[PDB]
Design a protein around this nucleic acid. Sequence first.
DNA 1: TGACCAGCTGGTC
DNA 2: TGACCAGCTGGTC
Lengths: 156, 156
Amino acid sequence: SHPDLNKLLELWPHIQEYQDLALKHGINDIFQGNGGKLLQVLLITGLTVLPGREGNDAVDNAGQEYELKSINIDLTKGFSTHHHMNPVIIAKYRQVPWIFAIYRGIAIEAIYRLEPKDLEFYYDKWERKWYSDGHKDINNPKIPVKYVMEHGTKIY
Amino acid sequence: SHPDLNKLLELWPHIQEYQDLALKHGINDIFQGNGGKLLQVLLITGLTVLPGREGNDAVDNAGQEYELKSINIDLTKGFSTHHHMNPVIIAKYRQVPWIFAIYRGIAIEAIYRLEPKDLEFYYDKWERKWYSDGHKDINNPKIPVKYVMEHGTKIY
DNA sequence: TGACCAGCTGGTC
DNA sequence: TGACCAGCTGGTC
């Protein structure tokens, strides 16, 4: 075993408390799908993740759904979407507003909200390519952080 | 914001320390790819993560590469593999031994190792099915926890 | 920018 | 059991 295993031990009880708080708010594993980050966004905005949801989607007090994305800017400048993008995937996106959270590794820096009207530029670009390439799925095309910051409304 | 936000604030400094520890050992984000749990396995076994790596693969002091998997037994019974299983993926898998970690919550219970000869039962089965189905990828077939415990060597 | 490419996993019946 | 159903992201230039 490596000598740092000792540090891991002292820190664990605090990590367990955090996982307990995540469970209280519907997140089963803080270590997958940006789980520990998702909790911060939820508590700041007041949004909720429902049991039986399909991904990182959440809802407000009135029941309106939102797609939640996150990015680590110390590594990349474009938000991930889907590994196999096509018109069926885009249809799931079309009618809901998106919430984009920006991080420096682990420290949250800002949160922006984009409406359907401000995402149509990308939905159209993706559908156009899909046809051109003979109905070939697109491998994870990105949404630039600058586009998000300029077109969206900052909420944090 | 949800009133529980104040709680996260007390916990945060400890969480940041854990991410600092992971960064020192080659892991950039404790909240994706079972990051926080992968670090625990690396510290227990003495394995290290090769920079420039594809995914969660690790190396020993002899330079032998390994594929590492993880599971939470209190809610899942089979280990994930690949979303698009095919002959190219199978040939990669056949070259290295695998390390399997078992958790109950975020509490680690055990770790097992299997050699290529111990997994051929599945590789042979999957390859035959790919050709037989008319060259169609298999979507994430699972390896049973019972199979791992009966055909592997217990390491922890 | 956006072109090419990749791995980490959960669920049901 | 195995055969299917799904999403979360990152690499080079």
